[PDB]
Amino acid sequence: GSHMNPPPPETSNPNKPKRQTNQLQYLLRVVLKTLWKHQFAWPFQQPVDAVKLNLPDYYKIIKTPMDMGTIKKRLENNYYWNAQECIQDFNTMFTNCYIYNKPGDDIVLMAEALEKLFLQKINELPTEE
Ligand SMILES: CC(=O)N[C@@H](C)C(=O)NCC#CBr
């Protein structure tokens, strides 16, 4: 919990209206479940600890951080109003990785594997019931 890392994204706020939808249930039970247990998930399971990794420029570059630990908390503590908000958090996580890291890099190949699974699952996101 270094003072040099920012506070994580919000996962609890009583002022924000919340709703359970069948699409948000799918995102937790199918999408997050699938990606969390992937061999390459672990770099994405918590906020980037730029101190531990000796990357002092990370939060100079990435101004909208997101990770699957935060998404999991948001889904489990239903923070979201709709599926689009959660889909945007996944998209942000992937795009941050591709912006910060070189296209060669192991971390980018890991994110691409997770994004390929993600796209397959989101194409099947159920009709809002
Ligand atoms: C989620 C994410 O982008 N993590 C990054 C910061 C990471 O682990 N870097 C790989 C390298 C070397 Br320089």
Curated annotation (Swiss-Prot):
Signal peptide residue numbers: none
**What tissues harbor this protein?**
Ubiquitously expressed.
How would you describe the post-translational modification of this protein? Phosphorylation by CK2 disrupt the intramolecular binding between the bromo domain 2 and the NPS region and promotes binding between the NPS and the BID regions, leading to activate the protein and promote binding to acetylated histones. In absence of phosphorylation, BRD4 does not localize to p53/TP53 target gene promoters, phosphorylation promoting recruitment to p53/TP53 target promoters.
Ranges for the Bromo domain? 19-125
The lineage's top-level taxon is Eukaryota
Covalent link Glycyl lysine isopeptide (Lys-Gly) (interchain with G-Cter in SUMO2), residues: K60
Locations listed in the record: Nucleus; Chromosome
Q: Where is this site: Acetylated histone binding?
A: N101
Q: What is known of its domains?
A: The NET domain mediates interaction with a number of chromatin proteins involved in transcription regulation (NSD3, JMJD6, CHD4, GLTSCR1 and ATAD5). The C-terminal (CTD) region mediates interaction and recruitment of CDK9 and CCNT1 subunits of the P-TEFb complex. It is also required for maintenance of higher-order chromatin structure.
Q: Which family does it belong to?
A: Belongs to the BET family.
How it assembles, according to the record, is: Interacts with p53/TP53; the interaction is direct. Interacts (via CTD region) with CDK9 and CCNT1, acting as an associated component of P-TEFb complex. Interacts with RELA (when acetylated at 'Lys-310'). Interacts (via NET domain) with NSD3, CHD4, BICRA and ATAD5. The interaction with BICRA bridges BRD4 to the GBAF complex. Interacts (via NET domain) with JMJD6 (via JmjC and N-terminal domains); the interaction is stronger in presence of ssRNA and recruits JMJD6 on distal enhancers. Interacts with NSD3. Interacts with NIPBL.
Additional free-text comment from the UniProt record: JQ1, a thieno-triazolo-1,4-diazepine derivative, and I-BET, a benzodiazepine derivative, have been tested on tumors with success. Treatment with GSK1210151A (I-BET151, a I-BET derivative) has strong effets on mixed lineage leukemia and promotes myeloid differentiation and leukemia stem-cell depletion.
Q: Which pathological condition is tied to this protein?
A: Cornelia de Lange syndrome 6: A form of Cornelia de Lange syndrome, a clinically heterogeneous developmental disorder associated with malformations affecting multiple systems. It is characterized by facial dysmorphisms, abnormal hands and feet, growth delay, cognitive retardation, hirsutism, gastroesophageal dysfunction and cardiac, ophthalmologic and genitourinary anomalies. CDLS6 inheritance is autosomal dominant. A chromosomal aberration involving BRD4 is found in a rare, aggressive, and lethal carcinoma arising in midline organs of young people. Translocation t(15;19)(q14;p13) with NUTM1 which produces a BRD4-NUTM1 fusion protein.
Described purpose of this protein according to its UniProt entry: Chromatin reader protein that recognizes and binds acetylated histones and plays a key role in transmission of epigenetic memory across cell divisions and transcription regulation. Remains associated with acetylated chromatin throughout the entire cell cycle and provides epigenetic memory for postmitotic G1 gene transcription by preserving acetylated chromatin status and maintaining high-order chromatin structure. During interphase, plays a key role in regulating the transcription of signal-inducible genes by associating with the P-TEFb complex and recruiting it to promoters.
**What protein am I looking at?**
Bromodomain-containing protein 4
Question: Upper taxonomic classification of the species?
Answer: Eukaryota, Metazoa, Chordata, Craniata, Vertebrata
Q: Which gene encodes it?
A: BRD4
